[PDB]
């Protein structure tokens, strides 16, 4: 009757960039996970903290779905303790991560002949991101001590780089829509539990 | 505040992100042109190519703003040093455009030169396929003579004034790059200066190429003598049993390979070589199965399978559509883990063997795909072809062909077939080593200024007689540029890679076969179904340019430097046969004799 809008999340016509990943709070609904783990369309279902079994006995206040597109080679970086450009500069998962990371190749959707550069990743940052932190700042990155004055010169680099996504790239350099389900519990009454 | 090692790392990360995309567009555009020859694709390839070329020069100029000595990371320094190679940029704008005018003029002369038959006036022929057919199949002394002399009179004389200006500008470019000369610049491909215990010098290359050449002379002397004795039957006159070999009478136009002398000089002509072409067509083999069986070869030794994108994107056969494709067998590392092979694969044994060769290039490309963008190459300029060449060695052996059912189970190898096989390998492998050594020795000294311009052709033909046992059919009077008649000399290509690769080739094979527990002659070895051999080779393949070639070579063969004993061991059954066949023949040559002396 009242199903959660997981279709509007997984089957969304367009995903956000990894640096500006879109977060949705799925609540006030009944979630059906049968079409998730029993579906062969997902090339990655590495779930951390909790397992798909023994799921009906847990209550979570809200469900957070972090949707973004990254390279296939960078799918391994969406995991606690990982190191890389995506892990440190774009999207960092907490070490105490409780949720399932769902990824699947989107070469048919997110790759075009000639390149699809609508997805950008923060190539440079002054420090590593905090867990679940989103950084949309787009100021010129200073490598050395020479000021940049808002224009990119030498040792002055624009922090955002655009993914080149062609359908002919190798499976490592291919778009992978990653949906990270984060389950949060607090002192709330926890209306949404799941029978 | 921040070390210069961090600045170059950040510079490399910015470079790598944009180099990956721009090179891929250049690589993808070049692939589209190579798999579809249309005028629009040429402009698309050039615009994509020029954008990548312009970007690289901009980054190279910025890379030279960082001090190279103030770097402690070996991996980072190799990337910056590769990027800091200014090249012809150091020349003035006046000279730089003049140099490119000279280089393009020589390439156009070489690709549009036409030697003309003196007897038939309107019989001018291009090198390919016109003069190459004459120099590879004809057995007439005069027919091979005018084609040989015509190519050097018509084209070499048009390259002599250009080559003299070419030498002066390339030396000025090299001396601007703090090199002794342009030859020293070319020897920098083998130089390793930062890994203690594996350092290699540009001068050490001369001392090592010379050392290996003095060890192949006795093998080459008997091969030279046996070929000369057999060529006496084909050419009773115009040759001397104690003299040298006329230059035109060799396998091809320059004598680079003796492979086309196999019919004239075959040891046992009554017993043919192993040819599985007929069996493949009788077993319903297609281009897909050739690359599938080639893939099975690398899986048996433990190398990874071909990617799914490889099968979807590669042009493994000539299309049935009307699109024009030049299908010289090449392996493509476009970028973004996009590995493709384009080949007009027919159902033949040669296409079966080169499928393992080209897939050997792809397996090399797949291995160092995890290396940074600037470190995705072979250990040196001779490693990439050495790895591909040893794949055809194992595939062509009767042991391998019997396992894949291309030979009858009861097929028995003959001793007079191993001799015929080894002799045909010596024509290509051993017949080219003196030629390759002499040509690079000449250019190194010409660039060094040891050969004055009034003695270029005087020392070219005195070294071709002393080192190669090859004598000019007709005298030349310094108005020629005989070396410039070759592709790699007119088109600015280093030629020593064809020498070191041959040494690396059998050095790899000898080591891999010992790991494969091969018992018997080395030329009978097949590393198939030997995961130990494949994993040891894969260790060097994954290195790319991250490590010096001296360190990469040692990880496979256990020897830091080039060793030619593995090459001598490969032809040892033939060398024993050659020395027994040369008991009643004179081994060696005298420089005094020339075809035109009388
Ligand atoms: C997305 O759509 C497919 C088919 O349209 C469906 O099988 C799948 O369940 C949908 N995703 C979700 C999360 O419902
Ligand atoms: Zn090759």
Author numbering:
A (entry chain B): 333 to 527
B (entry chain A): 18 to 615
Task: Please quote the paper that reports this structure.
SARS-CoV-2 uses the receptor-binding domain (RBD) in the S protein to interact with angiotensin-converting enzyme 2 (ACE2), which is also the receptor of SARS-CoV. The cellular ACE2 receptor is one of the key determinants of the host range. We found that ACE2s from sperm whales, minke whales, dolphins, sea lions, fur seals and hippopotami could efficiently bind to the RBD of both SARS-CoV and SARS-CoV-2 and facilitate the transduction of SARS-CoV and SARS-CoV-2 pseudoviruses into ACE2-expressing cells. Then, we chose minke whale ACE2 and sea lion ACE2, which displayed high binding affinities to both RBDs, for further study and determined their cryo-electron microscopy (cryo-EM) structures in complex with either SARS-CoV-2 RBD or SARS-CoV RBD.
We prepared complexes of MW-ACE2/SARS-CoV-2 RBD, MW-ACE2/SARS-CoV RBD, SL-ACE2/SARS-CoV-2 RBD and SL-ACE2/SARS-CoV RBD, and solved their structures at resolutions of 2.87, 2.93, 3.03 and 2.89 Å, respectively. Regarding the SL-ACE2 interface, seven substitutions are found, namely Q24L, D30E, H34S, D38E, L79Q, M82T and G354H. E484 and F490 on the SARS-CoV-2 RBD interact with hACE2, and S477, D405 and G504 interact with SL-ACE2 but not with hACE2. The Q24L substitution decreases the binding of SL-ACE2 with the SARS-CoV-2 RBD, and both D30E and D38E confer longer side chains. Transition from G354 to H354 confers an additional salt bridge with D405, strengthening the interaction.
